[PDB]
Design a protein around this ligand. Sequence first.
Ligand SMILES: CSC/C=C(/NCc1c(COP(=O)(O)O)cnc(C)c1O)C(=O)O
Ligand SMILES: CSC/C=C(/NCc1c(COP(=O)(O)O)cnc(C)c1O)C(=O)O
Ligand SMILES: CSC/C=C(/NCc1c(COP(=O)(O)O)cnc(C)c1O)C(=O)O
Ligand SMILES: CSC/C=C(/NCc1c(COP(=O)(O)O)cnc(C)c1O)C(=O)O
Lengths: 384, 387, 386, 387
Amino acid sequence: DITTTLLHPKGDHVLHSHAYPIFQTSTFCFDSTQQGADLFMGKGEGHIYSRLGNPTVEQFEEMVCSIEGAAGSAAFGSGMGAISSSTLAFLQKGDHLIAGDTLYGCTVSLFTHWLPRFGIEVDLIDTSDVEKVKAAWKPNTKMVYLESPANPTCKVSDIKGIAVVCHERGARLVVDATFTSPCFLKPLELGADIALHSVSKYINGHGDVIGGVSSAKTAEDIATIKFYRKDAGSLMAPMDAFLCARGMKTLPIRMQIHMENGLKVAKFLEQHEKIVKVNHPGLESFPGHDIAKKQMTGYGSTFLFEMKSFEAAKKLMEHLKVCTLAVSLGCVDTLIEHPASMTHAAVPENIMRKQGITPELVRISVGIENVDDIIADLKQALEL
Amino acid sequence: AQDITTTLLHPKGDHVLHSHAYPIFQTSTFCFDSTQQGADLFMGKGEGHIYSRLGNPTVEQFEEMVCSIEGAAGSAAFGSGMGAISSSTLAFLQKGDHLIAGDTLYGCTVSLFTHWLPRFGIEVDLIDTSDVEKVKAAWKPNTKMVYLESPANPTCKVSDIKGIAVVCHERGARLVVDATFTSPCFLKPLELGADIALHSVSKYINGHGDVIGGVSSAKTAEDIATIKFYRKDAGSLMAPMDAFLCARGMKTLPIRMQIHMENGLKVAKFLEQHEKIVKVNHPGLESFPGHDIAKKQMTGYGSTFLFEMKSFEAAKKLMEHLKVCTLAVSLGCVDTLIEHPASMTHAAVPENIMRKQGITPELVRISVGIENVDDIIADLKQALELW
Amino acid sequence: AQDITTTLLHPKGDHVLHSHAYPIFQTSTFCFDSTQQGADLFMGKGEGHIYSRLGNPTVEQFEEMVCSIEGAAGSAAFGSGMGAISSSTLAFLQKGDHLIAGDTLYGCTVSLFTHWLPRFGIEVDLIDTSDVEKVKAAWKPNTKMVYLESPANPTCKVSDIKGIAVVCHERGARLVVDATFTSPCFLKPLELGADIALHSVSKYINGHGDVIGGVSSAKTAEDIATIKFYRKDAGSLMAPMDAFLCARGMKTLPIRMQIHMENGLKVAKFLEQHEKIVKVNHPGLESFPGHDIAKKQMTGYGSTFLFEMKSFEAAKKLMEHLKVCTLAVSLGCVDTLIEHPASMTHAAVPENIMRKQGITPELVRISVGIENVDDIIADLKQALEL
Amino acid sequence: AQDITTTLLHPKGDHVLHSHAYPIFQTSTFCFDSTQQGADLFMGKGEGHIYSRLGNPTVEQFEEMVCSIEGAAGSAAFGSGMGAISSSTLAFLQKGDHLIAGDTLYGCTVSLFTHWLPRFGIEVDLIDTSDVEKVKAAWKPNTKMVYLESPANPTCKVSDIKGIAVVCHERGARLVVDATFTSPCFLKPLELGADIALHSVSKYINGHGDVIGGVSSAKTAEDIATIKFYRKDAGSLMAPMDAFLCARGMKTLPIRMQIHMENGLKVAKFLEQHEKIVKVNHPGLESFPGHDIAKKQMTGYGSTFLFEMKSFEAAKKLMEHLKVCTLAVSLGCVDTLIEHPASMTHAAVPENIMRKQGITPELVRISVGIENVDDIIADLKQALELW
Ligand SMILES: CSC/C=C(/NCc1c(COP(=O)(O)O)cnc(C)c1O)C(=O)O
Ligand SMILES: CSC/C=C(/NCc1c(COP(=O)(O)O)cnc(C)c1O)C(=O)O
Ligand SMILES: CSC/C=C(/NCc1c(COP(=O)(O)O)cnc(C)c1O)C(=O)O
Ligand SMILES: CSC/C=C(/NCc1c(COP(=O)(O)O)cnc(C)c1O)C(=O)O
């Protein structure tokens, strides 16, 4: 499985060290003027300066590249860095971008405030309906950007169907697969051109690092992305790369538990009288379950449910003993959040409506704690 | 008036669990007491933390240190100098705006302004900013920003920061200054009229050659908020461990700069009088054009500068036979570094910009560290005197 | 009751500035509010910190996690397993005391007990602790301690911890158990009657091969205070960064141990039926001597064990033609390690005491990781055909 | 001869993958090429690594830096000063041996020597080592070691290291010196005849208040090997991250020490002439007994020293009303620290030893940092002149 691959990354040992060393350095020495000059022209093997390339970071990049099935991967200081670099490395004044209508808050901010200032046209549309994508299409359409399942509502898009449109019509497909991890969703295997993650979430999974990663189908696209990163400057620190690579060693095993724990918690919620509705892609009752079972080999453990009022969401969120009230997701312990007033508080009213985000919704990110302990925590909070 | 050495060693803030050194907050998220307290923090109400991309205690401590020396309204830390530069320009410039920038700049700044900005509909002109009249002649109705690096990397070309600020202030343009080469001990652009002062922290501020990072400081609370708003979406963050290391390096910044300044002037004078050396571009030498501007507008000099050999082969022979100096890119480290701009830091600069910058194969750039200055001069002398 | 997985993920204690992950207190010293407040802390009242050698918040968080799983009065972290062992024995033993220790121990423990303790006037007997009557027969009027490893490094020899604890309780001696090889998920010596339980945290507890450290946990508040008092003067400290890494590694200990156990078991059964293998020393095999004791005293098994090849040449051929397993010392890492005890971990052990622990040039020690077992079996299988 | 500043910035050793900063080997174990190569390293021949308890590259780099300044045959790093002290004594002393140690020592060293060593059959006398005749009078046929701290913590009592060395050399005893208070910039006990020189690295060497560590250096390959043999079984290891930080702190050791030495002397003179101050114990003052010995045997002074107020109440009022100085134990940090030995560092010292040390409630110990010395003096002055 994917576990052996992750624990046995390709490459040589450094001074026979079993654990890969942390290259906490800015610069590298040259043997001669020519050797230094050659590296600047991309000939020969070696390093120049950590913003161009750091061995500890490259090891992390290789690990993600191996499970994505990519030509190459680039690490960043945050998911937002991956997202900016995977879009603005390509899009320019006069170009048009189609993006999902329901996206992580700060992605809405990027697509909605910054891109138009740089002369990029952006439409947000319901990407669960492939014909809706075809109708928004323009002659200057250069990219489609998807998040599936979406944050926070878990709305599922047909990545593979959109990928066909993109191939035929000459556009890049970018997919944020943060919510599912590369164990369960491999967008490049579905026709996508770029797959990206907030490493801050599942990939690292220990709640102690912010980082991003972007993987490209072609060698030319990852070189462009890295060229942008050189100038935009969102870098993963060597220490964070050591921590991310370390976290990734247990990724396959953690995902297995996240997925099963998640399925079980959602079912407890779906059949509980105080719960109106549960948005989890693995449920038969959820719209897009068929597409998601087809296009993914498993599910993340972050999902959303509806209470009967705002008072009751507040009641539940503030009387839990095990779950922690905090933003973020995909950590080893359980997190709980209120999107309307937190993660998606800054999202414009009209995008708020079309997304379906209301004060009645509560988002949970189920950890790898014993499931029954998680359920008993939710139980006492709901029933008391 | 308390000395800068004392200020850096005693930054404002409450201790955390009485810890003498400020802890490393290696965390992504923060817990809320209640939905309301968390809701409130999201709308800027109250004091506290949400998520490290928005604000991390260890990073904020480093920001406060830099803010206190720049004399700013606030500072923002980044994953690299280039993150600070992108976020200090593109947070304000939009399609249809015009930027005037110096014609001699760090190579990747040239890349950013010359490849990326035009793609975003931003008009850019690279101008000799050592002549205020050339800046005025380049001005247009839509000019919104002037960006300077002075002394410039790598030729040390000096721009009249005060003189250019007057023009920005009269015409509604922001003045942004990259002061990396001098450090905030010696060059404080906010006191000269700049709106934004920024640094690659990777050089002098950290000083120890073991971190890549950036910082930008704004005169106005609104401009720093805009910068951090851009940083939130562009995602160039300083990691907590890197902030801890940068704050630690900065504790010795004033005494390191004092030694760098003195060492670099002595090495530049030795080189200036050596038979093998054609000329020396250090802004503290009386022979240097713009020495008079540099001495009025700065309070000292960094120790990174450039000199001319008689040939490319003489430069290669020198660079490769040093035992104290290290052949490598970067600068501002405690130990002495040396490099060849034409084929290294500036090799990717388009040909017309590189000849406008005056960069040729005979030039060598040296970044003098805090080693004993006589050991540095002896290392250079032996190499210059080779069979 | 709350499951161990949940307990490790939700340790007791206040958050620091609302930080979700516990901060790394990379500091030597702490500030006082007042002379009295500083003087009061030095007298042990009430709450706070002075200096990291005395107590560091990051390190104490890790200590609390181990203490919670051991069921102890308290825990102390060290710079290495050898620091935990040294501090758990010499904190109590003095000139004229006598120590009974298992005859099969980690090589450096042998070095401690055999070279250093006798120089400090402490008498030491290495005896076969798998037979409780031999423990009784070695007993002396000055016996103050029994030290056990079970299963032993590297042969996996099992001792009757429960039976020996009764004798220790009867005769007024402390029982100290190194449970490194099994982890506190599966072996809990303090439940068995031991007074002190210790681990090289370098192995499973951290489990990522990137930290050296030790921990010792005591039944009584007085004993853990004595251990810490010794640590204050001896100076084997866990660094704040290493404590951050050990706490973090420990968050997945329960699920890692589960895979290590199942993985190890299957590899061991593969080897036991392979015609190039004379015997497998895995305590979870029905064949192995003292399996009966190990099944009763432990709730699982570690993934490190030993097995015999036909010759030294064959052992050499195995270890040098593997593609997935790594030739290296240590154990309990996420990936598979392989080692040759006679010329490595136990090379320094005196021939005399080496003879009677039954370690020969034909023995090979394997530490099974959390890789897919099928891949580990294939690696072994391919190499057993050259 | 190359300056110590240059030596510390250019340590011998190969670069690792051309990295300018030495990497952090956050690893427990190392891979072997073959059964033979692994077996050989345990023997041990020739070059390479096994397991970080036996040797770690990052830690070994820090060890070489110390070894080069001490002029030793080798150095060993530890998890704490106490770790270095335990391993520099108990690696050699066994049951039946006799140790002579100073009567004024760091409190936890008194604890080690008076509680733990006797439990191991080692005979210990604490002696006034400021008088070589008292040392000779305490000598017995089984004396194997003399252990000194000079200037002593906290009273700065000076011992004649050179005089005592002559006696150790003639009689077959090892001389062990704890030079923490002075740093290896100013005191090199191996040049004065000591067999072992050690430090709490937690103080000046690291200098930044953010690590606990120890180091010990021996004049002979055999002695450093025995120390490392002891270390491997006692298990007091320096962590890879802590070694990276100590090596980084030590890059500025010579310049920090120069500023500490001058600041401390100026603060001691200010205090000495102040009406509130009864006495000042700084070995650089001509009024101090043993000033003549310190001057001859050291090439400078650390900046930690003690002074006498008129009362406990006056000491407390001083300590609690400082804005620059920080109230906390420890010393040798870049910022100034202040402490009350009687109730803090030396509170657990048996009262027997407390009075031969001369430690009273009127004494305050100050560790003067590298802040501007006028800011430090103004902070003391304002607190001394309080209503
Ligand atoms: C301030 S709110 C906490 C952050 C949350 N998510 C982030 C996120 C990013 C961006 O990733 P960073 O830049 O690493 O945070 C990208 N893509 C997706 C699907 C995401 O969910 C959150 O709690 O929903
Ligand atoms: C590959 S070459 C090494 C880098 C060099 N300089 C960097 C630099 C930056 C950018 O700062 P980071 O992003 O922190 O590197 C910004 N501003 C200025 C005046 C700079 O000199 C160099 O060796 O000249
Ligand atoms: C160079 S040999 C590698 C080390 C091995 N183990 C060590 C060990 C320790 C000591 O713990 P540290 O001090 O953390 O190593 C204590 N107790 C037990 C049961 C052990 O196995 C080894 O591979 O057998
Ligand atoms: C709990 S009190 C704070 C510690 C202080 N000093 C320490 C010290 C050590 C021991 O070094 P570590 O083990 O690194 O602390 C050794 N040798 C000497 C001359 C020392 O001064 C103190 O504030 O006086």
